[PDB]
């Protein structure tokens, strides 16, 4: 066994919001059920004087009638008792893009190189997450070092998402 109850997942100890601040390139994402950013994701996190964290993010989504759409979203984060877990309200610069509240846990991140992200949307009765996305964010868009790569593969299995992650091209579709 493994314990895949969203309740037993260790996230970042002592998260410094003003040390996660900055551009993170998405590298592999785990898809939820529903419409998600297909590829080209880049998140830009900034913490303002009154301690809050805000994120804006660009990415391609193939809006059903099949257009394919670079969507800039905006997110404003509310803190919780854990410094590494928050609620996100998201929305788009264009009113037709998806608004919501997604959990947004930083599972791990050495702020100069990586960060796993996770968010559970629907939780199953026994506690395992029923609907969930996760991003592996690198700080340099080439990928990231093998060492930090080996920390992240690890983490991915602790969350029970190992073998569900797929790659993101960055090709310049925005």
């Amino acid at each position: 066994e493994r314990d895949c109850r969203v309740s037993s997942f260790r996230v970042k100890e002592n998260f410094d919001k003003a040390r996660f601040a900055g551009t993170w390139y998405a590298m592999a994402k785990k898809d939820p059920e529903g419409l998600f950013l297909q590829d080209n994701i880049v998140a830009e996190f900034s913490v303002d004087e009154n301690g809050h964290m805000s994120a804006t993010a660009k990415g391609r989504v193939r809006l059903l009638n099949n257009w394919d759409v670079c969507a800039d979203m905006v997110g404003t984060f509310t803190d919780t008792e854990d410094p590494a877990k928050f609620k996100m309200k998201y929305w788009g610069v264009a009113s037709f893009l998806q608004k919501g509240n997604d959990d947004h846990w930083i599972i791990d991140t050495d702020y100069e190189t990586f960060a796993v992200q996770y968010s559970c949307r629907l939780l199953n009765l026994d506690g395992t997450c029923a609907d969930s996305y996760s991003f592996v964010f690198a700080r340099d868009p080439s990928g990231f070092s093998p060492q930090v790569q080996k920390i992240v593969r690890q983490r991915q299995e602790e969350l029970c998402l190992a073998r569900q992650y797929r790659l993101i091209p960055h090709n310049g579709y925005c």
Binding site: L63, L64, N65, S95, F96, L97, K99
Partner: protein
């Protein structure tokens, strides 16, 4: 047709029927209370059909309320309208055929009536 009331719904964006929209007819009763009248999901052909009988469609202010937003959330676009409503008084002059036809797009919609008298 021998269809008391009847709804059609169409996707102006994708140029096709709006399949599986949750249409909810309501009949305002005696004291402004929208007591639940009838409900269905649009077919392959965009049509709800059979929602009452002539003895069950009574002279009143009816409401058809189309679930437009669940149509667009499950398509991944943030629509404008919470849902679409057609509030009409009915069968006061006996002409029992009513067809309501709606035309959906994210920030717009239209709805037309086609009130046809049976055989007087």
């Amino acid at each position: 047709s021998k269809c008391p009331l009847m709804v059609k719904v169409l996707d102006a964006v994708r140029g096709s029927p709006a399949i599986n929209v949750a249409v909810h007819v309501f009949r305002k009763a005696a004291d402004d209370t929208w007591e639940p009248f009838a409900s269905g999901k649009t077919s392959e052909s965009g049509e709800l059909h059979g929602l009452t009988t002539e003895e069950q469609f009574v002279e009143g202010i009816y409401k058809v309320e189309i679930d437009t937003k669940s149509y667009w959330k499950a398509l991944g676009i943030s629509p404008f309208h919470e849902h679409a409503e057609v509030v009409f008084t009915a069968n006061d002059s006996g002409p029992r055929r009513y067809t309501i036809a709606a035309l959906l797009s994210p920030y717009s919609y239209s709805t037309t009536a086609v009130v046809t008298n049976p055989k007087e």
